Amino acid sequence: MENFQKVEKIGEGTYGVVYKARNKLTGEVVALKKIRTEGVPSTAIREISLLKELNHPNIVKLLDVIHTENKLYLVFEFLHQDLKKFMDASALTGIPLPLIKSYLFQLLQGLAFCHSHRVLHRDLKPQNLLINTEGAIKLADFGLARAFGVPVRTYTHEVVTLWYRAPEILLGCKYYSTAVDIWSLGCIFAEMVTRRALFPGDSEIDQLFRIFRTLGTPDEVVWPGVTSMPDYKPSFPKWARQDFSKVVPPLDEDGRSLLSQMLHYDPNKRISAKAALAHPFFQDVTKPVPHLRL
Template sequence: MEDFEKIEKIGEGTYGVVYKGRNRLTGQIVAMKKIRLESDDEGVPSTAIREISLLKELKHENIVCLEDVLMEENRIYLIFEFLSMDLKKYMDSLPVDKHMESELVRSYLYQITSAILFCHRRRVLHRDLKPQNLLIDKSGLIKVADFGLGRSFGIPVRIYTHEIVTLWYRAPEVLLGSPRYSCPVDIWSIGCIFAEMATRKPLFQGDSEIDQLFRMFRILKTPTEDIWPGVTSLPDYKNTFPCWSTNQLTNQLKNLDANGIDLIQKMLIYDPVHRISAKDILEHPYFNGFQSGLVRN
């Protein structure tokens, strides 16, 4: 740890405090994530070990780089490259009446999806995508951060814990208690983020799991066996759910062109089996004519 100094606390992460720091040898500014260890006896928590093992494998220009892992007494520090801005802070910083440039939205969506495709091809789910853990720089680069809840998935798919994605970006199969889920949970989250970038407003702002579901149902209509085979058998599905029968999604997406709306509709398909894949997102007509270079924010 003597090679690094803390400059200031910049936030609370999933498992501990995050500091802005400096490498004393090189002068490089870094983000230092201090992982809480409950006691000396327990050693490094499996959550941290999982994050470390994942991030060391995930080398990609749109994934935050883990520079180093340091132990100090009963603490562990993860040293990441430093980016000062996240997508939520950026959107909040825009004037109330100003929307993100359409080419910037397209560029960010392309980069985020490229990172997630890279993960999915390596059998890794992110499971906690949200604007707060998408970090950006002045050049137009966006990087996926915080793989604290990421987890390699094998075949057969194990029964995963439900406590993952922040409520507003949480996929319906998770909210309805599906005992197994896969890559489509990340696609749903990206669809919600895409809509928020285009409109400046979170698409589904629920304050409880049931409120979150009902907000989805109001906009996308209440799912039935016709559009989502097996939905009525999911543990938390109730026959008493109110029945909203029209899809209002287009009304929520005034700023998007027809291709953008079509893409979001494919990302927000209830049935995970039919939800679009990361690979197919990148090949969608929404990106026709798009040069994958950076667009300055």
């Protein structure tokens, strides 16, 4: 690195290798993402550069976009743990409801902010939600999907997780809306509560059918226009909807109500981040300190 001192490899992200690094001049510790083929689209750099201005307490700050030696590096503020690791670590006892509520509330504030600035995430998952010792949680990688492209494989043949994909994406809709992020966050909310992924599909069709088996196969009544979707097939099995009381026990009715609104099939009926923040579930929200072992 021209000015960076690699501390350690954080992993192989969706867009490339990520390292925890220290700025030799500022002393600042950051996450450095090396972006993967041969050229680096100027449209991408302009788009990414715009995200440097998207600053909010619940959004991982994009510090710099470095385009040198015809290579692209993304410098992000560093956080010590991600929600996937935290959930695994909390698997035995479960994350306390007050902390689940604090995290959901903060994530919705982050989404409300991004969506108000016309920025979508499109690939929210526990691994992209970062936490610190102060009880904060932040969304990482907002806007990169649009600035770049389809995931599929990180850069070293790595199975793309479909568990948090909204149904309209799975049915081949070409235009994503802010609703896709609310769907993903609803899936994450459920997983924090039950300690098990809500829809752990291992293929696009298994993902879609797992959603259908739980929420019922969508029809024109609950989702106008669904039968005209690109990948909709009249041959899809018709499953009956299950009761939320069975899906996310023992979450209370306020929680079930909010989750149900975050998981509506019709993206237009799905609750917005702004509206969700006003839901009765957050009446008693607080900001607890998590037990973080680093």
